[PDB]
A = this chain, B = another copy of it.
Amino acid sequence: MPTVSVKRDLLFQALGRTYTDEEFDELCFEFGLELDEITSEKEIISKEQGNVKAAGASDVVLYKIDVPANRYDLLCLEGLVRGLQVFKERIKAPVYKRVMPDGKIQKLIITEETAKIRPFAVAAVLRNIKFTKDRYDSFIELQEKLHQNICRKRALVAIGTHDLDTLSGPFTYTAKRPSDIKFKPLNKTKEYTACELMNIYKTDNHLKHYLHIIENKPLYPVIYDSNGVVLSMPPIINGDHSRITVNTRNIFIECTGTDFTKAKIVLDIIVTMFSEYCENQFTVEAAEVVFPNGKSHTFPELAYRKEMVRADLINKKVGIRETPENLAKLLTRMYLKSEVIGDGNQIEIEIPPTRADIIHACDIVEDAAIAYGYNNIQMTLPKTYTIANQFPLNKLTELLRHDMAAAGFTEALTFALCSQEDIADKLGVDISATKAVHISNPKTAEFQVARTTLLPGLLKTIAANRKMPLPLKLFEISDIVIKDSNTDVGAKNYRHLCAVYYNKNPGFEIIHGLLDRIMQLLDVPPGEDKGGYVIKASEGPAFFPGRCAEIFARGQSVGKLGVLHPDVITKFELTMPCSSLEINIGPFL
């Protein structure tokens, strides 16, 4: 859920109106956005770090707007204002054209040492930007916004903005040994080496992540220029020499990474977003990127796709019956400049490079409906008769639940995850003989394995309810996982009905009687000479010897009936003795 903070007064000024805290909260809703909150850093630093009451330009009235992780052209104020502006037809949607410069055909060359750490990269420049205190921060913000978001913390794509007036001549993208590049990084006193920064950063709260999470290979990405100046070391930090500040006139933007198209997009977003501030408004100065391939492609490629969709489709899909001429109007307000094609049947839609989310015909429908306003769509009810059916298992379960309750027991809600010791050690068995499934890199200890039985959880429940009266009679009918070599995934769930008797004395006879009831309920006759069930004394490492049995029915072992062994009852920090029961109700269907 990408959030975008914006100076209110500015936002309003940007639009050309003043909004009530409702009027805007409404406009947000109307456009799929959400006005999450209205506060300021007077609430930020004032809530988790001592109390630095620093307010001179921090404590303000800014809106905390939530935006769909889908729309990228909405990660900065420039974008939200542009979007909402066209959405309410208060402005015509701007066109983004990339132009050729006057000889200074800036170029960035990719080498061979590249393809294996950050395969490709792309760049472009935007001439004479009239920056501002805010415009600057917005430009930097957007950069961060789509970095640790759409780029997956720079992992795939990394963007670098440079002050073109502080370097010149063809730039080079390549990779050299770590300890083979001196550098004067953004906020660093001296001038260090790549092999040197890497570890001096393992302590940097911000970059502590980005680095190793991406580099520790035989080469490191780097960008040079004619002079031999180091532009930046792509994923980690940029050069302080080419740093960009409020007074920068020309910006050279470069994007390197493992995912071509994404980078290609990130560029377009950045450049298309801020070209609103270039002298030659909404223009991006081409740039020539030369691949190891030896070929030269121009960037950014402000892609303008032109797919076609039939009007009847939009209607038949959304659930509205508007005319093609009006449908076009809708789509337009959404940035997708549409125009009806003569026979008022088909609508020609122009997909701007800003809305890179439109990838299928249906995506147009989305925008179409959003423009039309969801709540203006008449609710209709699908007229197809279908007979409902419960899932055999669950039906039975639902029944047993009602009788367990009739039989005086109380249903619980055990978690499905826990610690190995819960389903092994504490029960007198090694985690190697449980057939249990193991969770990778589990947060807590109680996230190691997935239930193999309901007995643990049930006990643990008693443990937390010591405050409860004389005999506790718990039960639960849920699933337990097991490894199964014969299932597409590797594991299988089983429906166990598990109950427990907690009292001064274990109710092993009353628990034995529960099983008898259950069987009686399932119409399963006692004895085997009729395909029924029987109790055959047996031994269990979790049951006090000689007070443990096995349940057999419909030609197989169903469960274990018995009195919990003093060891398990203490290892689960309990007082009284305990009688349990756990049958797999599966075979009884």
Contacts and interface: CB of A to CB of B under 8 A. Distances in A.
A77 to B, nearest CB: 47
A440 interface: no
Interface in A366-412: 381-386, 402, 405-406, 408
Contacts of A385: 381-386
Nearest to A402: B402
A386 B383 CA distance: 8
A158 to B, nearest CB: 54
Find the residue from A381, A382, A406, A408 having the highest chain B CB count within 10 A.
A406
Contacts of A408: 406, 408
Contact of A383 (B381, B383, B405, B406): B383
Interface in A407-444: 408
A58 to B, nearest CB: 48
Contacts of A402: 402, 405-406
A385 B382 CA distance: 7
A408 B406 CA distance: 6
A406 B402 CA distance: 8
Interface residues of A, number: 10
Nearest to A383: B385
A382 B386 CA distance: 10
A406 B410 CA distance: 10
Nearest to A406: B405
A324 to B, nearest CB: 31
A404 to B, nearest CB: 9
Contacts of A406: 402, 405-406, 408
A385 B383 CA distance: 5
Contacts of A405: 402, 405-406
A383 B386 CA distance: 8
A399 to B, nearest CB: 11
A89 to B, nearest CB: 39
A408 B385 CA distance: 41
Contacts of A384: 383, 385
A408 B402 CA distance: 12
A388 to B, nearest CB: 9
Interface in A3-55: none
A402 B382 CA distance: 35
Contacts of A386: 385
A385 B385 CA distance: 5
A42 to B, nearest CB: 45
A440 to B, nearest CB: 42
A178 to B, nearest CB: 68
A51 to B, nearest CB: 43
Contacts of A383: 383-385
Interface in A448-507: none
Find the residue from A382, A384, A385, A408 having the highest chain B CB count within 10 A.
A385
A384 B406 CA distance: 39
A402 B404 CA distance: 11
Interface in A62-82: none
Nearest to A403: B405
Contacts of A381: 385
A498 to B, nearest CB: 19
Nearest to A385: B383
A406 B386 CA distance: 34
A541 to B, nearest CB: 35
Interface in A339-389: 381-386
Nearest to A409: B406
Nearest to A408: B408
Nearest to A387: B381
Nearest to A410: B406
A386 to B, nearest CB: 8
Contacts of A382: 385
A520 to B, nearest CB: 15
A408 B405 CA distance: 9
Interface in A87-145: none
A384 B381 CA distance: 11
Nearest to A384: B385
A74 B381 CA distance: 51
A382 B382 CA distance: 15
A411 to B, nearest CB: 10
A518 to B, nearest CB: 16
A402 to B, nearest CB: 6
A35 to B, nearest CB: 36
A405 to B, nearest CB: 4
Interface string A557-576: 00000000000000000000
A402 B402 CA distance: 7
A408 B408 CA distance: 7
A402 B411 CA distance: 15
A400 to B, nearest CB: 13
Interface string A503-521: 0000000000000000000
A486 to B, nearest CB: 38
Given A383-B383, A402-B405, A406-B406, 11 more contacts: A381-B385, A382-B385, A383-B384, A383-B385, A384-B385, A385-B385, A385-B386, A402-B406, A405-B405, A406-B408, A408-B408
6 contacts: A381-B385, A383-B383, A385-B386, A402-B402, A405-B406, A408-B408
Q: Which 5 A-B pairs have the closest CB atoms?
A: A405-B406, A383-B385, A385-B385, A406-B406, A402-B402
